Design a protein around this ligand. Structure first.
Ligand code: FMN
Ligand code: ONL
Ligand code: AKG
Ligand code: F3S
Length: 1485
């Protein structure tokens, strides 16, 4: 999406402004999307003032006196096409106006030209007319629009796509539709009419994840245009709906408030909802600015910029008890008709750039160079920083900046005073050290009864207590889905966490913690629309985990509080109805805190009792409070024995709990600590006192929640609280709809009676030590695991001799039900053909992929051997996210007769045609060794959004594993842990992904780009977006897949089966006509030709293998990959261990033959000759006739079997060989004979070009041609390329040595993304009417992943400057937040003010900051870097020399002045120094 506004504060309204708005819209075209016809637009529109000169004709035609400016109401109405339905609608619109006691003047037909629409938009088109209205009593302005709003809502109870009021206002009007940008004004004749005039325009071009256009869903909506995605929508909607019955505001009657009722609706888009909820807040007394400060509040805590504005802190402090954020990426552009403004989400995940002239003319938008204004007139170029707003007061003719706007709102009420008097704060640093139970067997028995298992305490609780963090582990979740297990499991295990991918980003819970909060509020949620001291009478918890001391203080507190039991003597089903009824009645009696205890009156669980599992209890009370209209009266505390893991807490808050007392878990820690075995081990060298174990355990939980919220990009637990950021697998419909309403659950599992049967299994075990199941590690007693040490061994043997493949196959076939595919079997429609007729192994093998395992997680022996193997086969390997040694790009020459090569001496089993070049080069959030030559060496390029083991998160390589070798490849520091950021800092939305894919197709026009997703509900939709974004291939990873290190909780509770994933993507693509755009690839636990065929039938065209491939080359399933101790040399970097690796490429060539030969024999059974014939043939599947579940009668597999008929139509299998970027500026640069000469003869050349914002990634196709011929450093020539104007995204991305790029103007985001060499210079027009150092000239995430090169910019940057810089050098003149965020080397100089969170995660390299204000120490992330004054002469001279070069390239008056007064300013620099540069000559002496 693209969004913006233009305002003319000082002049008469004109047509010129409207033209500029159409043209800016034109400039955002590449941010938009189109329907299946490739013609109709996903949406565009414009909001303007009511066009008074245009409607003066309508009155003149009727011989009618025109009402004055604020007295004419105009409704832009979408009406039905059918003649009689249209008149019914017209009459009804007339009717509700009459009943609101206003006067209908008549209707204006909207002049339109339909012949310009695309065929889908033409078929959907509503009939468009405007109704004109006045008030007979005298109504005007605020009161009129307030009555118009009441009237529009009423009409809106009959909302259809056919019947929709775009705007009903005496000040604003919205022209929108399902069109491309430059079609908007061709379709709406009024917009080209020189009588259409306006002092402002808000504009929007929409990008949607679908093919089917709906005119109402274009933007702007009534008040606002929205670029972004709400990521807590279900929660935000449930809370808001609960408030609707009981709306109350002075100078509103009840009837007027009821007329608005459907305020919120889970069936309208997230934007339609936010708009509607926002207008409620405006029409009832607040400016749009204030309303947006409530719905989408700033990250105000520990904001140093707020030091001087405590009323602003007070404002948010108050409201954060009343209203949770509508979170996720957001640029909002809004207009009242009185004010026109914009504001950013709390983390600023969309760009907003603005521009101000000498006449206070202002242009804001997603991109900078988009309205052409004479540059000499520009007096300021700025940007919005995270959470910031800017507005225009149209009447007063004033530009309002961030702090004024916000102070004007905060100071309206003594919010601080109210909090100080009314809020009770409940926090205790100290625990209860004294035990709950006294004897020994009691805690054991209770633990057994509440579902604890030996691995729960030993592998989850204990590490949390002892180490102060949730456990790290490795490999994938190898065991059965909870619903398929014969092993007892808790209700929690049926729930899979959801996570962000593509359409919105994860956030970094560690580097960007400062923006997140675990704070919660207990009690009556107060009146949102009318601020009162009362609303602040609440109990604030600093964290959802409440200890024993804290709970007593709550119970002692200033609120009414009621114990409600979850125990019962009768059936869970009825036990739960009495529960729900007791809650309802208890709140209706006046209680403000309900404590659902499974230990009522202090008493313990006996054998004569059972319980309602706490997730079911709270799910149930939350939704029934809601259904009874009572959820705002009370908060839920869960006092429960059955909560211990990080996942458990997340489900609880997520399904309605404000807080949890995990009393048995706290006791489990107390009894773990007390206990002579544990004491014996703390005395001889396992690690701690008891208050610390307790403190550590709480710290683990809290860190674990930060992690989980962040996988979805959510900052505040308060937002997560409503929302139900889960998919359920194995829960039947009655249950879901009972306790978990709105959760998807696709496969129909358990009834309420079945969950009882499961608690009773645990009850049977309770009424010696806890039982150990094989959950985490294989056991002979234990749960099934598909990768077991013996399966491995026998496979390793079968591969070793060119029968042993039998035991391996049978160990895999004597399996209990494990995955969804196991419930399936074949049902052939042809008779079986001979095996000789089936396509050859060599033909099948071309579809296999080896899967992207980082060079750090694996050894270069393991990693290279797979590449050679896969290249021999004619298939593909994937260099995962650790970059790749250049030595590997060349075919091997020097293989001797024993099959050794001095080029690759650590490998064995080689022949002369081999190459260890990975056919797939991966691009991941760390960008580790991501180089133009690395990019040119791929046949394919893969953008990794997520992997099955840890979808919400970034890659993870422990410091033990970062050898000198790994550090060299990644351009990082040797001993240092690498936790990659969870988002690509490049991809905060679908249109950002389109831009990354563009950059890849730019550098390497012949390479396919793939996008790697993880299976979860919503992947269908996301994948439609990815295809529209021009990808070639979509990978689907199952929850299943391996890893060299992930959180154990992530391995076990995040992500869904790939069966649900492939299927969902295949269907959505097909039913949207997008299926031929992409090749689909699948992975996650694939081992077997059988697996291959299942995947094929469900719609996969290629097949990925990770863990299995490691097993072929010698992996056992020792499962210490995260440890550096791999006993067999596959997943370690210790040299002496690498030396154990026996392993030759042939062994893995052999493995893929067994697979392919099994494919052939399954193709024989079915009677088809090639996978090409069966891909997507779902009607060839059936439900296995012999299976019997432990936990429910059976599942329901309709969602896996009901795919669209594929017997006849097979054209979707034909793909374009590579998608083009279209005609690009760089092509004209390369077709120039002076340029071709410069490249061929390594001579000098020079060219100059005018640019516009649609000119994106300039330079980069020329880098790619250079690196193709010479790699990164062979080019001895010199090309200067001079540009004038506003550069689009990724200017100078992947720059090489020998490239000088000069830009006179400004640039949008991602300047010098992956820069590797050469020089980028960016200066303002010499004409400029401003001090260059005070003004923005480049955008966000410049030098992302930079690996070399020099950048000089005579202006300010945005956020994440030099985000993950490895070797880049730069001098800029100011920046936003998160400067040098994951920097590992290079040098960054910033000659002006800088935002907060500097050097977060900064682990190597040095930065210099000029600080004239004195407050930079306030703005540093203090976790790694130290700040010091410059004292080392070598550092002084590093700085000078960089500033000296800025000046030579740039002419920067700020640099000159600095050099001229060198000693005056030296002492004003701070140097940022990570503890890895501390003894560098530039930091020390
Ligand atoms: C040792 C290990 C390291 C991996 N590292 C990466 C990574 O660098 N990049 C990535 O996209 N996936 C990574 N993963 C995920 C795999 O690429 C692949 O998606 C997954 O292993 C397939 O599931 P499977 O292990 O059951 O075959 C890795 C997997 C393992 C086993
Ligand atoms: C492109 C964009 O930011 C989408 C906005 C909103 N979610 C929608 O229109 O679907
Ligand atoms: O090497 C890395 O940085 C990450 C590899 C990884 O995330 C994994 O082992 O799953
Ligand atoms: S599990 Fe990992 S630790 Fe080694 S044996 Fe396999 S690579």
């Amino acid at each position: 999406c693209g969004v913006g506004f233009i305002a003319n504060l000082r002049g008469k309204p004109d047509h010129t402004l409207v033209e500029q708005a159409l043209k800016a819209l034109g400039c955002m075209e590449h941010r938009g999307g189109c329907s299946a016809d490739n013609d109709s637009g996903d949406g565009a529109g414009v909001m303007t003032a009511i066009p008074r000169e245009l409607l003066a004709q309508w009155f003149n035609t009727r011989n009618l006196p025109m009402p004055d400016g604020d007295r004419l109401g105009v409704g832009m109405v979408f009406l039905p096409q059918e003649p009689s339905a249209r008149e019914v609608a017209r009459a009804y619109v007339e009717e509700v106006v009459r009943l609101e006691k206003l006067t209908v003047l008549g209707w204006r037909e909207v002049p339109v030209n339909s012949d310009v629409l695309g065929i889908q938009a033409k078929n959907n088109q509503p009939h468009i007319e405007q109704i004109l209205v006045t008030c007979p009593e005298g109504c005007a302005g605020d009161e009129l629009d307030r009555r118009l709003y009441i009237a529009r809502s009423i009409i809106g109870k009959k909302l259809a796509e056919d019947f929709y009021v775009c705007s009903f206002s005496c000040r604003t009007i919205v022209y929108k539709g399902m069109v491309r940008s430059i079609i908007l004004g061709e379709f709406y004749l009024d917009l080209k009419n020189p009588g259409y005039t306006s002092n402002f325009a808000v504009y929007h071009r929409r990008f949607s994840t679908n093919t089917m256009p709906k005119w109402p869903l274009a933007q702007p909506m009534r008040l606002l245009g929205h670029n972004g995605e709400i990521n807590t929508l279900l929660g935000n909607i449930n809370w808001m709906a609960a408030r609707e019955k009981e709306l109350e505001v002075s100078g509103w009657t009840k009837a007027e408030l009821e007329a608005l009722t459907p305020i919120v609706n889970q069936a309208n888009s997230d934007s339609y909802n936010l708009d509607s909820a926002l207008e409620l807040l405006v029409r009832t007394g607040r400016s749009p600015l204030e309303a947006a400060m409530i719905l989408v509040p700033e990250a105000y805590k520990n904001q140093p910029a707020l030091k001087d504005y405590p009323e602003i802190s007070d404002f948010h402090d108050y409201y954060s008890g009343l209203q949770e954020p509508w979170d996720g990426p957001a640029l909002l552009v809004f207009s009242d008709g009185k004010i026109v403004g914009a504001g950013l989400d709390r983390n600023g995940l969309r760009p907003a750039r603005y521009c101000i002239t000498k006449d206070d003319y202002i242009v804001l938008g997603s991109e900078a160079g988009v309205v052409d204004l004479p540059e000499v007139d520009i007096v300021e170029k700025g940007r919005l920083a995270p959470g910031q707003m800017i507005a225009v007061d149209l009447a007063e003719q004033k530009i309002l900046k961030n702090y004024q706007i916000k102070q004007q709102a905060a100071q309206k009420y003594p919010y601080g005073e109210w909090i100080k008097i009314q809020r009770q704060t409940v926090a205790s640093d100290s625990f209860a050290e004294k035990t709950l139970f006294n004897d020994a067997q009691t805690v054991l028995q209770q633990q057994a009864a509440f579902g604890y298992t030996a691995e729960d305490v030993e592998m989850v609780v204990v590490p949390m207590a002892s180490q102060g963090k949730e456990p790290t582990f490795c490999m994938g979740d190898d065991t059965p889905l909870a619903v398929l297990s014969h092993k007892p499991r808790l209700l929690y295990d049926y729930f899979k966490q959801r996570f962000a991918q593509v359409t919105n980003p994860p956030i970094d819970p560690l580097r960007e913690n400062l923006v997140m909060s675990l704070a919660m509020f207990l009690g009556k949620r107060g009146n949102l629309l009318e601020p009162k001291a009362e609303s602040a009478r609440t109990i604030k918890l600093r964290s959802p985990l409440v200890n024993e001391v804290e709970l007593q203080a709550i119970k002692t507190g200033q609120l009414q509080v009621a114990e409600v039991s979850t125990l019962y003597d009768n059936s869970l089903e009825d036990a739960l109805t009495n529960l729900v009824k007791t809650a309802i009645a208890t709140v209706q009696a006046g209680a403000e805190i309900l404590v659902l205890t499974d230990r009522p009156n202090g008493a313990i669980l006996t054998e004569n009792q059972s319980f309602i599992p706490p997730l079911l209890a709270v799910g149930a009370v939350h939704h029934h409070l809601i259904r009874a209209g009572l959820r705002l009266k009370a908060s839920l505390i869960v006092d429960t024995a059955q909560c211990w893991s990080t996942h458990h807490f997340a489900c609880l808050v997520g399904y309605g709990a404000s807080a949890i007392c995990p009393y048995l878990a706290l006791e489990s820690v107390r009894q773990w600590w007390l206990d002579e075995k544990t004491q014996k081990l703390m005395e001889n060298g396992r690690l701690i006192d008891l208050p610390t174990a307790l403190k550590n355990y709480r710290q683990s939980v809290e860190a674990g929640l930060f992690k989980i919220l962040s996988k979805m990009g959510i900052s505040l637990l308060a937002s997560y609280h409503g929302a139900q950021i889960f998919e359920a697998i194995g829960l039947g419909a009655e249950l879901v709809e009972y306790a978990f309403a709105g959760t998807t659950s696709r496969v129909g599992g358990l009834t309420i009676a079945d969950v009882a049967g499961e608690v009773m299994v645990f009850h049977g075990m309770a009424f010696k030590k806890l039982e150990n199941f094989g959950f985490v590690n294989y056991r002979p007693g234990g749960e099934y695991h598909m990768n077991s040490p013996e399966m491995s061994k026998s496979l390793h043997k079968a591969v070793a001799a060119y029968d042993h493949y039998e035991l391996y196959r049978q160990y895999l076939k004597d399996r209990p039900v494990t995955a969804l595919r196991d419930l399936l079997d074949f049902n052939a429609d042809q008779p079986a053909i001979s095996l000789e007729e089936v396509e050859s192994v060599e033909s099948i093998v071309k579809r296999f992929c080896t899967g992207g395992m980082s060079l750090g997680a694996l050894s270069r022996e393991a990693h290279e051997t797979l590449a050679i193997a896969m290249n021999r086969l004619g298939a593909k390997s994937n260099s995962g996210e650790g970059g790749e040694d250049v030595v590997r790009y060349l075919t091997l020459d020097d293989v001797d007769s024993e099959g050794n090569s001095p080029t690759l001496p650590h490998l064995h089993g080689l022949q002369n045609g081999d190459t260890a070049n990975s056919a797939i080069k991966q691009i991941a959030s760390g960008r580790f060794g991501v180089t133009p030559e690395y990019l040119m060496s791929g046949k394919q390029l893969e953008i990794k959004m997520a992997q099955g083991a840890k979808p919400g998160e970034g890659g993870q390589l422990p410091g033990k594993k970062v050898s000198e070798y790994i550090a060299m490849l990644r351009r990082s520091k040797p001993g240092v842990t690498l936790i990659s950021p969870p988002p690509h800092h490049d991809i905060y939305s679908i249109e950002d992904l389109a831009q990354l894919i563009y950059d890849l197709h730019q550098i390497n026009p012949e390479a396919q780009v793939s996008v790697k997703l993880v299976a979860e509900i919503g992947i269908g939709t996301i994948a439609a977006g990815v295809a529209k974004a021009n990808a070639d291939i979509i990978q689907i990873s199952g929850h299943d897949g391996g890893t060299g290190a992930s959180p154990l909780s992530s391995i076990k509770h995040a992500g869904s089966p790939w069966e649900l994933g492939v299927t969902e993507v295949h269907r959505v693509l097909m039913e949207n006509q997008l299926r031929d755009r992409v090749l689909l690839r699948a992975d996650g636990g694939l081992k077997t030709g059988w697996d291959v065929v299942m995947a094929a039938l469900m719609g996969a065209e290629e097949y990925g293998f990770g863990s299995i491939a490691m097993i072929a080359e010698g992996c056992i399933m020792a499962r210490v990959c995260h440890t550096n101790n791999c006993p067999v040399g596959v997943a370690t970097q210790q040299e002496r261990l690498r030396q154990r690796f026996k392993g030759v490429p042939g062994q893995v060539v052999n493995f893929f033959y067994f697979i392919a030969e099994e494919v052939r024999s399954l193709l024989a059974h079915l009677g088809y000759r090639s996978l090409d014939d069966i891909i997507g043939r779902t009607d060839l599947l059936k439900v296995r006739s012999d299976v019997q579940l432990s936990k429910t009668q059976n599942l329901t597999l309709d969602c896996l079997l009901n795919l669209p008929d594929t017997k006849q139509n097979r054209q979707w299998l034909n793909h374009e060989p590579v998608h083009s970027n279209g005609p690009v500026l760089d092509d004209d640069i390369l077709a120039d004979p002076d340029i071709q000469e410069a490249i061929n003869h390594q001579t000098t050349a020079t060219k100059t070009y005018r640019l516009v914002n649609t000119d994106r990634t300039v330079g980069t196709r020329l880098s790619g041609a250079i690196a193709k011929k010479y790699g990164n450093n062979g080019f001895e020539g010199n090309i200067t390329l001079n540009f004038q104007g506003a550069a689009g995204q990724s200017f100078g991305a992947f720059n090489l040595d020998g490239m000088t790029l000069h830009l006179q103007g400004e640039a949008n985001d991602y300047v010098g993304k992956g820069m590797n060499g050469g020089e980028i210079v960016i200066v303002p027009h010499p004409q400029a009417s401003f001090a260059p150092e005070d003004n923005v000239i480049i955008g966000n995430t410049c030098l992302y992943g930079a690996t070399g090169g020099n950048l000089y910019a005579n202006g300010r940057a945005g956020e994440r400057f030099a985000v993950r810089n490895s070797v880049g050098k730069a001098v800029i003149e100011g920046a936003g937040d998160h400067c040098c965020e994951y920097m590992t080397g290079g040098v960054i100089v910033v000659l002006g003010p800088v935002g907060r969170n500097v050097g977060a995660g900064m682990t190597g390299g040095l930065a210099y900051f000029l600080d004239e204000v004195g407050d930079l120490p306030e703005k540093i992330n203090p976790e790694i870097i130290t700040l010091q004054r410059i004292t080392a002469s070598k550092g002084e001279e590093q700085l000078k020399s960089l500033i000296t070069a800025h000046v030579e390239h740039t002419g920067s008056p700020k640099g000159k002045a600095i050099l001229a007064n060198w000693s005056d300013y030296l002492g004003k620099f701070w140097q940022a120094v990570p503890p890895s540069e501390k003894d560098s000559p530039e930091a020390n002496n």
